[PDB]
Amino acid sequence: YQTERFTKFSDTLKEFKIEQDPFNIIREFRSAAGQLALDLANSGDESNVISSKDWELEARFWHLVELLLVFRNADLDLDEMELHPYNSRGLFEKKLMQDNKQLYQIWIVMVWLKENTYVMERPKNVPTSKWLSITSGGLKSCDLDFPLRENTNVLDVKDKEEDHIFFKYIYELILAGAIDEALEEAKLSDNISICMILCGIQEYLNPVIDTQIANEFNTQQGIKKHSLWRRTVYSLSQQAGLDPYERAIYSYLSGAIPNQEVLQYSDWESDLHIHLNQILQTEIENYLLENNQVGTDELILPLPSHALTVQEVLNRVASRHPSESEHPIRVLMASVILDSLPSVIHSSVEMLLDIIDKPYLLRIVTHLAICLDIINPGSVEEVDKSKLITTYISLLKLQGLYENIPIYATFLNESDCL
């Protein structure tokens, strides 16, 4: 049956033109692609695993589109936040994310990135308790820093192997946004001190002082000397004789770029995520410095102060992952991220004048163009709509689905000619 696909997308358009909000179209496009992603994936010829991934990718694209256009377009402007110098850093961070839409967009994108991150299954047969080295005798101190104070030869091999299992799992969870799960794992796996480390992630708020969040909070929380925390963690991240995943974790937390042993396995998404995290971290800490909410004592160490632009991060990550970068829906992903989107529409339009070779593309661009001009009348050049629908329609003909051509017609007087 699967050669139903176009129906689903077409179907969604029917429902929209007929209850005369348009963001639902895309939401459905997403779900549609995802549903199809499942079909080709389950039981299939190993020629299908490929086009299955191109559907999952499809789906992620629709999601990213929804998220960003929702934020950008459903922008109806709220009330400005008035801080005082007595206010906590927590509030200033919030203010920053409110006022600077460019940067919040980075947040949105990171959220999307996390959403679609793979995490291993929870490690089984985890041991009763930590470094259980203790049994061999030779841990004179039971604290994480003991084998750092003096040769790592202290820790049993099996203990290191388990610490590896743990820190890797925690790392995957952190990259996926699963911070609560990471704290649960830390707690329950007898890694209290690491847990505690994960608690430093929050900026300080006090509901009593920072009135404008006396709703979200009933109790002070987060840590006041955060610039310190951050250097402390970063330095910890640079100290070798720690497991590469642990160092990786601290790198991510300090707004830094994890060690080579770990980073070598990160893909376009993972890598891009890492570097947006860096942009973000740097930008916040700079925002705080420009408002004298950082205390000089805490500038223990040099961290880089110069934030990249999303443009440049993308360019670098691209050159670091050319194969992946060049994949045609991931180009759209980037195009959406930079807003250069009608830009790319008109572009792939002129590539019809090695876009015909891949099937999803011509469809996707067309439905995207439709969505765009629905949500933002004017968005895509009238001509480009004409050209796109023209060509896709002729494929509806080549597929023998003339049945559902009128729906796509509802965008030109050129429709007359059908």
């Binding site: 358009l13 209850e19 004017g378 968005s379 009238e382 729906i407």
Partner: protein, 742 residues
């Protein structure tokens, strides 16, 4: 305020914040009030100091640039805008300004060219963009001509640019080319609707008539150009009456009448003669519309006398026969002429009626009293000043012979409207007017046919109804839209006159009858469909349409009052229930059921006398004038249950449809019961098949006969039931004749 009010506030904040930094950070808010007190050498230094501490504020920098603009210091003003623009790129209007100022001061530097390119991509093909393109060139005749031509290639519908082409032709005194383009451009439907273009058309033609070149060249094409002048006059008259004031409209009439008098003498049997015929009608129609405009503002005694006078004018117009279309050289020309004919009969038609509904056979009196030549002098009197020579005025010399004095037939009126939908480029003004004119009549207009005449091959319903992307726009969406526009418009005008007839206003005189929101949508979807949008503005137009789709389909956060939904539901049921084909029946019934399914939850809350959650900036204004009452709830629930049954029948659930239809003894349920009982009989009626089954088959045909008879019996007895018929009475009788002969 004064000088004291602002300079005394100096000591107000000086005593609240005395440090230099905060003293200078208040400079912008100090300068905020000196700009209001007309102090520009002072306001300049106040803002300039705030700029000394707040050097990254795009607002302050622009404010100084706007202040240097009042000082006319271009070099200083431009630089200020630049800083605000480089700080904040979203300030598009400043990119135009910079480009606007750079081209006005000096073009020698390429910087003025650069900023003009950006200004173009921020405002695709805006009216100002070309203006700047011409300014930059100014700093030679052949050079200007090429710009306009290259500009007209991609922008043929721009009023200003085409005007400039005529002006360039006129500057080189090659007027023959000026009219030539003027003639070939009178085929453009958009330009024909432009007031300023038609004004240019009237002049460039007259100039050619008097021009030495017109006589020397030949007297063969003289008639051809002369036709366009009359056409231009008609279009110009339609527009001047609506926008311009009483004085200007009347003045245009005199030029029109002079032209008519100068043309009638030649006569003949060609396009010019045929044009004179149709334009003659327009003259009176517009003259009648012109008459009614004056009386509206005036007293009652003048109103009746003027409306009496106008009624005669519209009558004269309506009488004028359909022009001889075959007699024109080309297909475009003849189709145009006919289009205007339909417009004349339609507009004058509804006016004739709305004025005749005031009294009984009011029309007869109008003719019997003012058809007398005495009326011709009373018409010339009220319209014009008697001082002008009454000999060369067409109005005073026309032979008013045998006025038909026959009120118009609705069926004829419908085909006039449908044929004239494209008369005024389908402006929502045009349709909302017609829709309102039919709001008082017993027969309803073929809106679905109007839309088919406008957006050809636009599907009735789009397959991809799931999303609101505006590529899925359907004639139903539009039909659903116009219904609300008219239902909304009527209520708004009803409220207006209540505070202070609404039907009686002619089309030009009345103002915008729809909300600018609604008008913006229609203009957008129109430009989009007809493929006259702008590659840059495509995405904006597309979204503008998308915004309203979810309301036309009663989806998330629809700004729809329950009464308007019900009106949509029933208006589509009865619209669909009268259609012949199944495809159309299904669609219209589907949408009707859809809207019904959205209302009933509201009606149930309203049924227990609770409050409806009012909307947020609705698309169709709410009104308590038509708020649903409990007295009418049970009826809608019943009328809806019919609409459900009808769709069940069309889908195949005959058992449940009949079970429902039979439950309510309604005239409409008979026509449905009958129509579906007849089908079960006719198919099985003549093929070889079990005899017992044949008897059961005949039995259904017997039920059909009975239900049709119940319709006619109850129909002839009461008039209210005649109006409830889902199809015409004669159509019901038509079936019965065939039913019994079977």
């Amino acid at each position: 305020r004064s000088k004291a009010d602002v300079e005394r506030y100096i000591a107000s904040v000086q005593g609240s914040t005395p440090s230099p930094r905060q003293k200078s950070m208040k400079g912008f808010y100090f300068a905020k009030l000196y700009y209001e007190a007309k102090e520009y050498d002072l306001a300049k230094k106040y803002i300039c100091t705030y700029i000394n501490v707040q050097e990254r504020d795009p607002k302050a920098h622009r404010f100084l640039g706007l202040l240097y603009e009042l000082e006319e210091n271009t070099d200083k003003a431009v630089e200020c805008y630049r800083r605000s623009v480089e700080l904040n790129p979203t300030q598009k209007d400043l990119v135009l300004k910079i480009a606007e100022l750079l081209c006005k001061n000096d073009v020698t530097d390429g910087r003025a060219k650069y900023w003009l390119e950006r200004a173009a991509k921020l405002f695709p093909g805006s009216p100002a963009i070309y203006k700047l393109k011409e300014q930059l060139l100014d700093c030679g005749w052949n050079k200007l001509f090429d710009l306009i031509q290259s500009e007209l290639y991609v922008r043929p519908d721009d009023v200003h640019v085409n005007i400039r082409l005529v002006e360039v032709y006129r500057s080189t005194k090659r007027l023959k080319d000026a009219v030539a383009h003027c003639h070939e451009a009178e085929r453009n439907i958009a330009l024909r609707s432009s007031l300023e273009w038609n004004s240019c058309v009237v002049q460039t033609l007259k100039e050619y008539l008097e021009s030495l070149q017109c006589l020397e060249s030949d007297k063969s094409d003289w008639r051809a150009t002369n036709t366009d002048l009359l056409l231009a006059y008609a279009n110009l008259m339609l527009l001047t009456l609506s926008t311009r004031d009483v004085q200007e409209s009347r003045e245009l009439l005199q030029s029109f009448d002079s032209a008519l008098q100068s043309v009638k003498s030649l006569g003949g049997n060609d396009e010019l003669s045929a044009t004179f015929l149709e334009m003659k009608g327009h003259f009176y129609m517009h003259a009648g519309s012109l008459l009614l405009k004056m009386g509206q503002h005036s007293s009652n005694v003048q109103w009746r006398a003027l409306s009496e006078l106008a009624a005669l004018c519209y009558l004269i117009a309506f009488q004028v026969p359909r022009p001889k279309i075959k007699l024109i050289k080309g297909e475009a020309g003849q189709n145009l002429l006919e289009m205007m004919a339909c417009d004349r009969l339609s507009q004058s038609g509804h006016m004739l009626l709305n004025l005749s509904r005031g009294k009984q056979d009011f029309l007869k009196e109008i003719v019997e009293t003012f058809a007398n030549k005495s009326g011709q002098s009373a018409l010339y009197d009220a319209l014009f000043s008697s001082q002008s020579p009454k000999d060369t005025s067409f109005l005073g010399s026309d032979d008013i012979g045998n006025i038909d004095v026959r009120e118009p037939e609705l069926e004829d009126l419908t085909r006039y409207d449908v044929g004239a939908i494209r008369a005024h480029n389908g402006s929502l003004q045009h349709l909302t007017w017609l829709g309102l004119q039919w709001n008082s009549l017993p027969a309803l207009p073929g809106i679905r046919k109007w839309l088919k005449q406008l957006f050809h091959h636009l599907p009735h319903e789009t397959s991809r109804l799931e999303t609101n992307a505006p590529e899925s726009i359907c004639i139903l969406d539009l039909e659903v839209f116009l219904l609300g526009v008219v239902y909304t418009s009527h209520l708004q005008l009803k409220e207006k006159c209540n505070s202070h007839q609404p039907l009686c206003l002619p089309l030009p005189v009345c103002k915008q009858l729809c909300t600018e929101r609604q008008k913006s949508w229609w203009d957008a979807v129109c430009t989009l469909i007809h493929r006259k949008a702008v590659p840059g503005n495509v995405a904006k137009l597309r979204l503008l349409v998308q915004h309203e789709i979810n309301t036309l389909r009663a989806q998330e956060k629809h700004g729809l009052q329950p009464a308007l939904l019900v009106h949509w539901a029933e208006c589509l049921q009865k619209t669909g229930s009268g259609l012949n084909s199944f495809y159309d029946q299904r669609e219209y019934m589907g949408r009707s059921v859809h809207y019904w399914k959205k209302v009933l939850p509201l009606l149930k809350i309203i049924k227990k006398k609770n409050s409806i959650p009012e909307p947020i900036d609705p698309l169709f204004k709410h009104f308590h004038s038509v708020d649903i009452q409990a007295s009418e709830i049970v009826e809608y629930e019943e009328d809806a249950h019919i609409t459900f049954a009808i769709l069940d029948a069309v889908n195949g659930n005959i058992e449940d449809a009949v079970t429902a239809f039979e439950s309510i003894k309604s005239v409409v349920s008979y026509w449905n019961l009958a129509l579906i009982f007849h089908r079960k009989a006719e198919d099985i009626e003549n093929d070889a098949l079990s005899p017992e089954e044949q008897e059961e088959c005949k039995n259904y045909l017997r039920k059909t006969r009975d239900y049709l008879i119940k319709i006619i019996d109850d129909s002839d007895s009461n008039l209210s039931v005649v109006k409830k018929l889902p199809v015409p009475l004669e159509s019901v009788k038509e079936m019965l004749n065939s039913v019994m002969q079977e």
